[PDB]
């Protein structure tokens, strides 16, 4: 696989991709 | 956080998995 | 706003738009 | 849950808002 | 909800989200 | 170009790409 | 209309072009 | 226009509704 | 990573994320 | 092929990786 | 149609749009 | 390449077809 800049909606779409059924949290404030 | 890790600096799909539940 | 029919990654996009800086958690069943 | 509801039926942005941090 | 920068295709995807069945116009020239 | 099968937000994306700076109107039935 | 046609059948980019401003 | 309102400067989902039909 | 259910443009997005700078080829049947 | 497999069944990111250049 | 900047995932989504069944290659290294 | 053609400098949908198989 690769390392890339994933931002905004693309970041959460990548999280969706990677995590899928596990689910995920997107917490930009940290 | 994730934005720093991925957006601001490059991350891998493995590092993305860090944010799975 | 209108009701939504959102599957897969479209739900994540919608959550992203709705939650902005707050972020969100995505938690499918199973 | 919301993920299924939004897919197999419909959901509102207001219901989605519940899932924000 | 939040305020964010929505640009390009993301802007029209947000319009789709918000307006849905009502439809919308995307008129970047104004 | 090829014919398209476009539902939901994919149609909006396609309209966005097709129309560019002209923008477009999205007008579903009902 | 185009929104339905593109979904329940197929549509061309040329038909889509009609919807540009 | 919308691009100025949303893209160039932040807008809300309510302000987005300004562009619904 | 989780298994994926990817149709249409979602497969292309997934290929894009997976392949990064390598790029990829998208080759549907027929 | 992969395009169909990923749609009509499931596919892994590892199978997808095969399609990178 | 128009000329626009198509980048990243948007580029490959546009390729998907234009090429569809033909398929395409996305080869950013050239 | 495509990135130079489309991303860095504007391209048309016709020029995009250059990258179809
Ligand atoms: Cl972007
Ligand atoms: Cl879909
Ligand atoms: Zn984008
Ligand atoms: Zn979709």
UniProtKB/Swiss-Prot annotation, chains A, C, E, F, I, K:
It comes from the Eukaryota. It comes from Homo sapiens (Human). The gene is INS. This is Insulin B chain.
């Amino acid at each position: 696989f690769v390392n890339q800049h994933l931002c905004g909606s693309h970041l959460v779409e990548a999280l969706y991709l990677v995590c899928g059924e596990r689910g995920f949290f997107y917490t930009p404030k940290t | 956080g994730i934005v720093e890790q991925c957006c601001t600096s490059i991350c891998s799909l493995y590092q993305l998995e860090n944010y799975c539940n």
